[PDB]
Amino acid sequence: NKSDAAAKQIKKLEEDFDGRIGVFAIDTGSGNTFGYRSDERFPLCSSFKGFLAAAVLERVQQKKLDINQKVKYESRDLEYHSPITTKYKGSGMTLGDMASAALQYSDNGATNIIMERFLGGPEGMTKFMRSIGDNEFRLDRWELELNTAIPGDKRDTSTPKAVANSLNKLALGNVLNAKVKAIYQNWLKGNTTGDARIRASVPADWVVGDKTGSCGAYGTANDYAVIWPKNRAPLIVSIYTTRKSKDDKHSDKTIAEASRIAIQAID
Amino acid sequence: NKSDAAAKQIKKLEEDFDGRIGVFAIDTGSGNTFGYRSDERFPLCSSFKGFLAAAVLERVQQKKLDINQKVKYESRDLEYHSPITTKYKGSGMTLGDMASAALQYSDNGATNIIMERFLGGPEGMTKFMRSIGDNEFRLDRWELELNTAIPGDKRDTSTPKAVANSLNKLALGNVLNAKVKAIYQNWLKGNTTGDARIRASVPADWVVGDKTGSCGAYGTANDYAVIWPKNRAPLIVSIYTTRKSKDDKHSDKTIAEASRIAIQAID
Ligand SMILES: *C(=O)N1C[C@H](NOS(=O)(=O)O)CC[C@H]1C(=O)NOCCN
Ligand SMILES: *C(=O)N1C[C@H](NOS(=O)(=O)O)CC[C@H]1C(=O)NOCCN
Ligand SMILES: [Cl-]
Ligand SMILES: [Cl-]
Ligand SMILES: [Cl-]
Ligand SMILES: [Cl-]
Ligand SMILES: [Cl-]
Ligand SMILES: [Cl-]
Ligand SMILES: [Cl-]
């Protein structure tokens, strides 16, 4: 009944704000899961940047790239919302610094630079996800056009379950070695954009790493997280939302409440 | 929960002054530790000069340099805050005297001279730290640019834990031989800049060697110390702080208080 009760609550919440909520959560201790619309497609928005950073780290661990190599872009016309890359344009940034900027500040210049030079574009990003056994994720376009969030459009989408599974494999599993995995975890823990979302759904003293997305159309926003509860095995939580109308604004509170519901469902 | 109690106290202290405090402390006699934000990055400021001095001593021990060789610089335009090098510009200084000046007086001319001629610049300084198994420390720039302490900037940072571990290895461990280690200890014991920080958190008759950092922007300041309590095995304490606003001044009192808290946490 517990799963059906949680589903009832998400359904009401999505109706309350005239939109659509997709959830997948895992208690990695018990194996218990909860899903709601967990196989439906939602726009990725900036959330894919969390996976981009993991792809960089994999290349680093395979010795194909060096985390400390200098990335120069002195001549580049920086994309909108490049707060970190803008500041270091004169000096360059290390590959590590650029990747973590993409994740923690949603820096679009950092994102496009990495895809152009190191990852093989949206195709290469998709191939990375295929390489870890994620068959749902697809990135089709570059920043910022990947953020259109048009209803029914399959471009630049994944599913809540596929996102949760991939995050589990990357942040907690075997894809990255112990050393590089710890770097990835630290990057997620230092994300700056997620304070009103999954982070808002758990006690102050639980440790959270997350990445958000906020397309800026169709009230489309999301969050995924690895949560370390005090003295317990970690949780994985993946929350994706869309809204009916183009001009609808996203709802952080809806995301946080859906997170609260999912966490109880697997408890 | 003695750890949890101490964490609550540091958290409150950082909220009190609208900033961020990172702590790592070791009782070398029991191996007990306490950490708070101990894996987060903080600007090194002048504190790296304590490690620069150790790097010089290692070169001396390897017979790549002589502690008494004359270092001349009669034509040099000395960096701001070079009180010791300024006084011997006409005659030169011994390598040992120059290195101890860098540590005990935060002499910027001493610092840059040593990095230019003997250590291979910021890259060589970083290589030294890597050579003792410190994987977090990074020096990217020269004096005085390394002191900008821009929020979110990873240049010229380390973590409290890595700083404490490295200080343990250098001041108390096996990197330097018994003879050269004694010189390093004496240099730290004679630091002149740390009276209001870790030194202020222990009794007058405990022996302390330390190095401070005071970036001079973003209320960014720090201290690390080896402490010999009367009749007890030595302690290692590492305290790093930042503040929210550019014009915020550093807080010696907050550093001293965080040190008091850390020392109790491990006792
Ligand atoms: C990512 O989806 N971004 C970047 C930025 N912050 O990331 S968030 O914390 O995840 O929201 C806000 C804008 C957003 C977009 O680039 N959206 O594009 C809107 C029109 N293309
Ligand atoms: C070491 O931390 N510093 C900080 C200094 N900037 O702080 S400021 O001088 O107050 O602006 C730059 C280099 C180095 C020192 O020279 N330290 O001594 C300066 C006075 N505490
Ligand atoms: Cl960052
Ligand atoms: Cl989209
Ligand atoms: Cl805080
Ligand atoms: Cl010698
Ligand atoms: Cl020189
Ligand atoms: Cl130089
Ligand atoms: Cl700095």
Summarize it.
The structure is a homodimer of 267-residue chains. With 267 residues, chain A is an alpha+beta fold.
What does this entry look like structurally?
The structure is a homodimer of 267-residue chains. The longest helix of chain A is centred in the N-terminal third of the chain and has 15 residues, at 2-16. In chain A, the strands form 3 sheets. A 5-stranded antiparallel beta sheet of chain A has the order 2-1-9-8-7, sandwiched between helices. The first copy, chain A, has helices at residues 2-16, 49-61, 83-87, 95-105, 108-119, 121-131, 160-171, 178-189, 252-265, and strands at 19-27, 33-36, 42-43, 70-71, 93-94, 157-158, 207-214, 221-228, 235-243. Helix content of chain A is 39%, strand content 17%. Chain A is built from 9 helices and 9 strands. The radius of gyration of chain A is 18 Å and the shape is globular. Chain A has one domain (2-265): Beta-lactamase, CATH 3.40.710.10. By secondary structure, chain A is α+β, with helices and mostly antiparallel strands. The A-B interface holds A 68, 84, 87, 94, 96-97, 100, 104-105, 186, 190 and B 39-40, 138, 150, 152-155. The site of one copy of the ligand *C(=O)N1C[C@H](NOS(=O)(=O)O)CC[C@H]1C(=O)NOCCN has 12 residues of chain A, from strand 7.
Name the CATH superfamily assignment of chain A. Answer: DD-peptidase/beta-lactamase superfamily
Report the CATH topology name of chain A: Beta-lactamase
How far from one another are the termini of chain A? 13 Å
Q: What small molecules accompany the polymer chains?
A: ligand OP0, chloride ion
Largest interface, with counts of residues having CB < 8 Å to the other chain, equals:
A-B, 11 and 8 residues
Oligomer: homodimer
The class by helix and strand makeup of chain A works out as alpha+beta
Q: Work out the count of structural domains of chain A.
A: 1
Residue fraction in strands of chain A: 15-25%
User: How many H/I helical runs of chain A?
Assistant: 9
Order of helices and strands of chain A: HEEEHEHEHHHEHHEEEH
Sheet with most strands: strand arrangement of chain A? 2-1-9-8-7
Helical content of chain A stands at 25-40%
Specify the CATH architecture of chain A: 3-Layer(aba) Sandwich
Main beta-sheet annotation of chain A: 5 strands, antiparallel
Number of strands of chain A: 9
So what's the CATH class of chain A?
A: Alpha Beta
Radius of gyration of chain A: 18 Å
Shape of chain A: globular
Pfam families (chains A, B): Beta-lactamase2
GO molecular function (chains A, B): beta-lactamase activity
Organism (chains A, B): Serratia marcescens
Family (chains A, B): Belongs to the class-A beta-lactamase family.
